[PDB]
Design a protein around this nucleic acid. Structure first.
Length: 341
RNA sequence: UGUACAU
């Protein structure tokens, strides 16, 4: 049901098509793959009057265009380049529909863009609509990116309804594919009194989390961007378990970020842990230097260890070379010790 | 030689 105008334009029949030569058709073009691209382009170089021409027609049809696979890009354009009046006018069209848009495949894309370009007042009005549906949104493949975007953009003081919805759902959520992403945002952007309760739960479950395909990513975040005190609780939980955890697909990564991001003393106490303590009938370092994952840990110890501790490790390894040569994951550990002596 | 985000 494409107008002859759209058809002809979609078939190279208007190399000089001007913005004003499509008035009456602004929706039609917005829902087309080429039409939508055309509009967006001419819109950058557009005059104030031209841009109003187009706004008149997209405002009229705003919600439809928001949940459209092409229309949404046209709308996002106005949040970026439109005037303050055009932005507030679009955000007003959204009022009432924040949640259904956030769960919508294309709608969430608009929300994310609106959140990034409307004034705090309108941001705060928009976010309020999510209260009551915080976990529905987070566990959703679209919503989760809105929530993520809320945390990045809105005053933290406005996001307490979220922190309150995470109470008792920190672990369950850090083991969620989307949940874990949102936990990271919160840790990055939220206020001290908000991150406290999150970190409380995080610590109570550090053991389970470090071995979880998503959880482990959250612990790594804390070891990379977190407060020293928090780091130490994590490493206090890795300390002693260094051998077992380094042989794990997921947790082996945590152990590297402990070796890497702990204090100078803690770092030295973790490296010594594998050099001393032994494994059943074999030595710890021995087991690790040939394991498919743990071998990476070893190399990461060789790195962050100050020359003193690094000589003892090189020395501790030197005897097992021939065994190392026989195992495939011992190759890159060999590479390192070979460059040494 | 080893793990996660959508038009």
């Amino acid at each position: 049901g494409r107008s002859r105008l759209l058809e002809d334009f979609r078939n190279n029949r208007y190399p000089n098509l001007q913005l004003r030569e499509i008035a009456g058709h602004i929706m039609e073009f917005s829902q087309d793959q080429h039409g939508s691209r055309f509009i967006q382009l001419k819109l950058e170089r557009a005059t104030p009057a031209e841009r109003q021409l187009v706004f008149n027609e997209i405002l009229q049809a705003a919600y439809q265009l928001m949940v459209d696979v092409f229309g949404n890009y046209v709308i996002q354009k106005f949040f970026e380049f439109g005037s303050l009046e055009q932005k507030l006018a679009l955000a007003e069209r959204i009022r009432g529909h924040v949640l259904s848009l956030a769960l919508q495949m294309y709608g969430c894309r608009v929300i994310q863009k609106a959140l990034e370009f409307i004034p705090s007042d309108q941001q705060n009005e928009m976010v309020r609509e999510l209260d009551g549906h915080v976990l529905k949104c987070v566990k959703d493949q679209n919503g989760n990116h809105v929530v993520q975007k809320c945390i990045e953009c809105v005053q933290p003081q406005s996001l307490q309804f979220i922190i309150d919805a995470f109470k008792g759902q920190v672990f369950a959520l850090s083991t969620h594919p989307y949940g874990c992403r949102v936990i990271q945002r919160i840790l990055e952007h939220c206020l001290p009194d908000q991150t406290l309760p999150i970190l409380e739960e995080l610590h109570q479950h550090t053991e389970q989390l470090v071995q979880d395909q998503y959880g482990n990513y959250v612990i790594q975040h804390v070891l990379e961007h977190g407060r020293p005190e928090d780091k130490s609780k994590i490493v206090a939980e890795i300390r002693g378990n260094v051998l077992v955890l380094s042989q794990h697909k997921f947790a082996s990564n945590v152990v590297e970020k402990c070796v890497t991001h702990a204090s100078r003393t803690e770092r030295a106490v973790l490296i010594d842990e594998v050099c001393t303590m032994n494994d059943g009938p074999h030595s710890a370092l021995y087991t690790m230097m040939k394991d498919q994952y743990a071998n990476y840990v070893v190399q990461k110890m060789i790195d962050v260890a100050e020359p003193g501790q690094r000589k003892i490790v090189m020395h501790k390894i030197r005897p097992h070379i021939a065994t190392l040569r026989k195992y495939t994951y011992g190759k890159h550990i060999l590479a390192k010790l070979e460059k040494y002596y």
